[PDB]
């Protein structure tokens, strides 16, 4: 997640914005649970009022929430 957000922090924290005590915090990560590996993601159309959306669907989910963890 650090290297996946590296370009966005590089752009945002940059010349565009300086620092201040309450602005340092950047991202939050929370877990939603476990899912059977090697199945993957089925790609499905979700149709409303004659308009579609591409949606990833995950079978056999196991819900388990976690606290928020601060990333910067």
């Amino acid at each position: 997640l650090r290297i996946y957000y590296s370009p966005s922090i590089m752009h945002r924290y940059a010349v565009v914005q300086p620092l201040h005590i309450e602005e340092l915090t950047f991202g939050a990560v929370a877990c939603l649970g476990t899912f059977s590996a090697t199945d993957g993601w089925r790609r499905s159309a979700f149709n409303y009022r004659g308009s579609s959306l591409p949606v990833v669907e995950i079978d056999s989910f196991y819900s388990n929430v976690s606290d928020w963890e601060v990333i910067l």
Partner: protein, 50 residues
């Protein structure tokens, strides 16, 4: 395209698909067979694996 000072040898490896024949003489191996088993595991929320 002037010949350099030295000569060279060139080596390569080649693969050939081939349909083989296998003969076996009679009664060359004794085999012991066991009873098959069936177990269950990976109980997950919608499925079971056996």
């Amino acid at each position: 395209k002037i010949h350099p000072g030295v000569a060279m040898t060139v080596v390569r490896t080649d693969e050939i698909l081939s349909e083989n024949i296998l003969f076996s003489s009679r009664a060359s191996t004794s085999m012991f067979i066991g009873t098959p088993n069936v177990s269950r595991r990976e109980a997950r929320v919608d499925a079971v694996t056996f």
